[PDB]
């Protein structure tokens, strides 16, 4: 849950950017100022979604690696034929499973990379791989989640 | 868990059968030394202090590594109950 | 590593003429810091023997060649009039933490092994704080600190360490 | 209890294997004696007199003792 | 260190001697230290007096008067210490000067006659029965008197009840039924209330108007006007309405019984029963119950008030007479004394019976002494009450605290004449009264709820077992300092105010103030306040009052936390909590772990063994210090001496500490650096991860002792010897068996070893043929004896620390029949802290050690210092005991600041004050750095980026500052010592007192593979070495049944247990290397057939066709 | 106790336990390896904790 989630912060000046152009440059500097965060209320987009945009899944992680964007930060990345707007963590989770189970596409046909992962959220995913895939391949799916869960957690602070 | 437990669970008409079958074959895989096996040459059973599972480790792990590969045969009533143990004690050395 | 008292049979007894419990004493030696002088001493044995009104202390350990007791004043036991205390304390050179249930040494049959730690290092701390230097300012300033019983040197240690590591990177050699 | 029921197993067969490597003319008399009925050296043997009892007895017994020292089967007392 | 306490509600008066309930009573019980001249005749003196004047007049010849003169005790057979070395009770001499009278010539006076022996109470409170410290558990019951309860099935009106004690005192009831019949069941069957009301002159003219003219029920009384016309006739008339065969002319026959002597009487004139009788109803009652005989004419100051109250109850409003059967003003507790004194009078009964026969056996004048009284009675019952009495068990003495809470526990279950085990539901609830009388938490959990309870800290039994409590007075605004321990009943009478009520010296300080009117939380006015509460401490029991922020822990958990403490195994590295409630010293001082000094003086010789005080009165005394002694539980007790040499002592100040005594305070655990966060699932559900650094410094280690024993049974096959002969394999096994027979002191005795050697004779009645031939071949002169030597039970065993033999020429022992000699090999072990162990804090975070981690990679502060334990947070949201989270915050500030804290129950520290200490802490923690010459990690700054989005810090402020805000919440920036990388997010850390838990014998990881079996049933059993089998429960059967686990279930029903042929076949089958032998049958069944067959019922199994099948395999085919 | 990095497939019990458990299955293996010549013998090996090579 910690890893796949987003944030939201202070709303000062009204920011409904989806429309204007000068509502990008001016708000990008103000972001470098003390009013428009990166997790700011930007309906169609928050300055975060503009600044960082990555080409490859990996790309996202290194950034996190370098203290650029945290896993819970609003970013834009390029997954199969689509400019997905999400967080590094959310994309990480996808991998975590995509890896656990190499059928990278299937892994997509069942995970809701849009909401935080809770108890039911997962439950669904488990009962999913069960039906869809094998059974034993689902044994490892759990263990995988066991691992990435016992680890992120300890650092979640 | 176990290598292809599904494929195994799918080559029979009941969960409880696969069990018997692997069980019965395993017993005979011992009752008659360890040469009545249906496979062996290349990549097959193995342990590690030295590669010694090749001879006598798990009875049943074998039953399941054989019955999984489409070599063995089994049925409700395939071959006459008594003459079975006969030939079997006749073709396979081990004791 | 192991102690041997005069008239004490087992670790759970009481020395007449010594407030201390025979388990409070071996618990007191676990705080003894010796500094061997050269390799030829994987082990040394220290003796003592005191009587009457006296507070047995480290200094009271009758000296030895290559051995220096950095802990001259740490208490050992309290003795009253008519109290006898003549013991034998086997010291050692080792590494890590080893339960007395693990080495169980056999000097005199009546001896009792002491659990023992070996790290001369008491605690390592480091503080990587940025450091400004013209060009850019995302400059790292590593500066590890080390405390030590004295058995060895904060510095001596720092070196063995960096070596042990250098020696370790060494296994990243022959592929297969 | 199982460990004993297993000892009569080993004891039986091993003493019975070390029963054959003998000249039945006297072995099978002490064998069944303590073995079969009950343990009296006098009215011991069928026909032959006493001095031939102890004879093959004390000798067979011993030969029986050393052919086993080699093939150590009973050594570690099954009892 | 420094100790700073918190909050303040001027605790007016100290706690009571926490053992008064026990000591003090047993005192008044048997006044042995005061001459018969003194004026006290209760319990012992009472029972006696009550059971002596035996006036057996005529049944032939005798008329022998036998009185009591002076009872007395004097010198016990052996001392205590010795009473535990051997196996005897710690009794005392008990005789009294008796003399009998002759309706002729002579009044022989044969003084001393010790008719048995009566046990004694230790200075601490317990007894000694056979080597084991025993304690008697207090008990509650229905206070004698009268009560009116709502009639069972008829929602009409209510009935009455007369309750006496002894049980011989008739338990009467009253009830009316208008259309011709009224009722009163003394013994049983009903009869006219007036039928007996006339047996006392009470006529229908004075009774009908001077009793209930204000009651329309008098018409149910006048009814039978026929019997209502003859005085001393209703004494025979009713005497007839009974049923034996008896004579209608037995004058003062059974009416005596309902008079004075034994039945209706309560202990002593004044309060043993009149309190209830009077206060509640009526006004007076001379003598005990309806007592009198000096005139022949009876007086019943009993039956008149009852009706004069029932008719007063079933009508109008005298007040609100209904009676709460569970009000503590109606339930009484019987201290050890009453429990003993009563079982002491059952003995005077069996005696008075065996003696009556002797008044009809003796020749003539040689009778007073032994020809009239024998000890066999009294000495078998009392003994029986100390040895088997359900209301008496082992002294839970894992630790001082325990042996104290036990001593003062109360149980409903007991005599049987008092609350059994069917009932409960309403009697288990905590009552509006337990406030300050019994804890509302302490009680057990499970089938035994509310029946067993422990009382409050200030509570105490006044005069007649009506648990009272310290309540102080308040005149108008003025608040007294004087206290009046009040009974339940006489409490409801006032408007009591709580203890945490703002004060101005002696003046409440607020128009509104919370008080409690008979269990009714009310916000009242000052001038109304009549009484106030002494302090919170009084509301709760003892154990509970040792918890830190109680007030923040869901009472549901307060219990765990309160019982955990009891399981506190006495660590060698004892240590008092960084935060203390207050009772720290009181517990130790009042239990008896540490050794204090009587009066001023100096110090002579402090020996790990002895302390000799130098009192300034010229004298000097040695004080023995039980070194490494064995406790019932096994947790050692060693009084380490604290006072140095020739030190000028201060009266009352401890000399040496006890098991849990650290400096003099209660040390049940070890203050330790905790950092509550999650780990790699190592602390998953309730698990705990530890810092191996705790082991390096002998911290959570404890000294435990075990006592193995063996006898030289005197079989008829040859005496059993205890020689150094192990007839078969090695000397390597004899080694430590140095001494001939027993084992040498201080020898490591790993399991399987020979603690003692012994030898009995192999076969029942015969050698062995098969084995005959085998032994002869290698040396027939093979010692035909068996090695039945006592060995170290699988599991573990430390090193021999002391042994005890008892061969021939027995000193004073009591070797049982067949016991030639017993041997004992006490062993001791320094159990270190290892996985699988359990720890817990006083709040209830009970958890089990699951991972020991190397200092090198667990959570470390910024400055090298690495935590000790890692608690999972997920354990605190649900268990609503945030209390423990305050203990850590306050705790951290206790670290860096180098000082302790006391945080009283309710009036303790508050978030703010703590928030202040944390700040003054942040310096010692951070101020240093600023001076040691270092800035802030390139990590700390990074965590601060996250620490704001979290919203734990004011954006913009300086990094330096930001940490203060953070640290003050209790959180710091920890580094993952496995990587150097920071746990992304501040984490709370700090000092938390954590105790180790005592391992039950269940802990002994058991394990069986093959073992004995019952003679009868043939299912498995353990013993000395082999482990006992596991019971395959029905539910366990279903689980398997539910599973396709067909065979697996039959396995358990035969092989692994009930198949003799099976296991047998089975064992071997394995060894050789085959699939087990298909199960025979279970004996359990075979036993059923023959069992069933014992009953003319034939049970024969069948086949395909209805043709026989033989279970008992052929063994049942006759001859 | 929790077995974190463990795998569903497995579980972890103490040897000291396992030892008793399949004891006889061990005796036999004991005789197969050279750590004991015969059963009854091997039995002795596993009777005292100190003599367990």
UniProtKB/Swiss-Prot annotation, chain A:
It comes from the Bacteria. The RNAP catalytic core consists of 2 alpha, 1 beta, 1 beta' and 1 omega subunit. When a sigma factor is associated with the core the holoenzyme is formed, which can initiate transcription. Belongs to the RNA polymerase beta' chain family. DNA-dependent RNA polymerase catalyzes the transcription of DNA into RNA using the four ribonucleoside triphosphates as substrates. This is DNA-directed RNA polymerase subunit beta'. It comes from Thermus thermophilus (strain ATCC 27634 / DSM 579 / HB8). The chain holds residues 790 to 946 of 1524 of the full protein.
UniProtKB/Swiss-Prot annotation, chain B:
It catalyses: RNA(n) + a ribonucleoside 5'-triphosphate = RNA(n+1) + diphosphate. Pfam families: RNA_pol_Rpb6. One of its GO terms (biological process) is DNA-templated transcription. It is an enzyme of class 2 (transferase). Coiled coil: none annotated. GO terms for cellular component: DNA-directed RNA polymerase complex. InterPro entries: DNA-dir_RNA_pol_omega, Pol_omega/Rpo6/RPB6, RPB6/omega-like_sf. GO terms for molecular function: DNA binding; DNA-directed RNA polymerase activity. Its EC number is 2.7.7.6. Keywords: DNA-directed RNA polymerase, Nucleotidyltransferase, Transcription, Transferase. NCBIfam families: rpoZ. HAMAP family: RNApol_bact_RpoZ. Promotes RNA polymerase assembly. Latches the N- and C-terminal regions of the beta' subunit thereby facilitating its interaction with the beta and alpha subunits. Belongs to the RNA polymerase subunit omega family. The RNAP catalytic core consists of 2 alpha, 1 beta, 1 beta' and 1 omega subunit. When a sigma factor is associated with the core the holoenzyme is formed, which can initiate transcription. This is DNA-directed RNA polymerase subunit omega. The gene is rpoZ.
UniProtKB/Swiss-Prot annotation, chain C:
The gene is rpoA. One of its GO terms (biological process) is DNA-templated transcription. DNA-dependent RNA polymerase catalyzes the transcription of DNA into RNA using the four ribonucleoside triphosphates as substrates. The chain holds residues 54 to 229 of 315 of the full protein. It catalyses: RNA(n) + a ribonucleoside 5'-triphosphate = RNA(n+1) + diphosphate. The keyword Cell division does not apply. The keyword Transferase applies. Its EC number is 2.7.7.6. Belongs to the RNA polymerase alpha chain family. GO terms for cellular component: cytoplasm; DNA-directed RNA polymerase complex. It comes from the Bacteria. GO terms for molecular function: DNA binding; DNA-directed RNA polymerase activity; protein dimerization activity. Residues 1-176 are annotated as: Alpha N-terminal domain (alpha-NTD). This is DNA-directed RNA polymerase subunit alpha. Keywords: DNA-directed RNA polymerase, Nucleotidyltransferase, Transcription, Transferase. Transmembrane segments: none annotated. Homodimer. The RNAP catalytic core consists of 2 alpha, 1 beta, 1 beta' and 1 omega subunit. When a sigma factor is associated with the core the holoenzyme is formed, which can initiate transcription. It is an enzyme of class 2 (transferase). The N-terminal domain is essential for RNAP assembly and basal transcription, whereas the C-terminal domain is involved in interaction with transcriptional regulators and with upstream promoter elements.
From Swiss-Prot, chain E:
Its EC number is 2.7.7.6. One of its GO terms (cellular component) is DNA-directed RNA polymerase complex. Pfam families: RNA_pol_Rpb2_1, RNA_pol_Rpb2_2, RNA_pol_Rpb2_3, RNA_pol_Rpb2_45, RNA_pol_Rpb2_6, RNA_pol_Rpb2_7. Coiled coil: none annotated. Keywords: DNA-directed RNA polymerase, Nucleotidyltransferase, Transcription, Transferase. It catalyses: RNA(n) + a ribonucleoside 5'-triphosphate = RNA(n+1) + diphosphate. InterPro entries: DNA-dir_RNA_pol_bsu_ext_1_sf, DNA-dir_RNA_pol_bsu_external_1, DNA-dir_RNA_pol_su2, DNA-dir_RNAP_su2_dom, DNA-dir_RNAP_su2_hyb_sf, RNA_pol_bsu_bac, RNA_pol_bsu_CS, RNA_pol_bsu_protrusion. GO terms for biological process: DNA-templated transcription. The keyword Iron-sulfur does not apply. One of its GO terms (molecular function) is DNA-directed RNA polymerase activity. It is an enzyme of class 2 (transferase). The keyword Transferase applies. DNA-dependent RNA polymerase catalyzes the transcription of DNA into RNA using the four ribonucleoside triphosphates as substrates. The RNAP catalytic core consists of 2 alpha, 1 beta, 1 beta' and 1 omega subunit. When a sigma factor is associated with the core the holoenzyme is formed, which can initiate transcription. Belongs to the RNA polymerase beta chain family. This is DNA-directed RNA polymerase subunit beta. It comes from Thermus thermophilus (strain ATCC 27634 / DSM 579 / HB8). The lineage of its organism: Bacteria, Thermotogati, Deinococcota, Deinococci, Thermales.
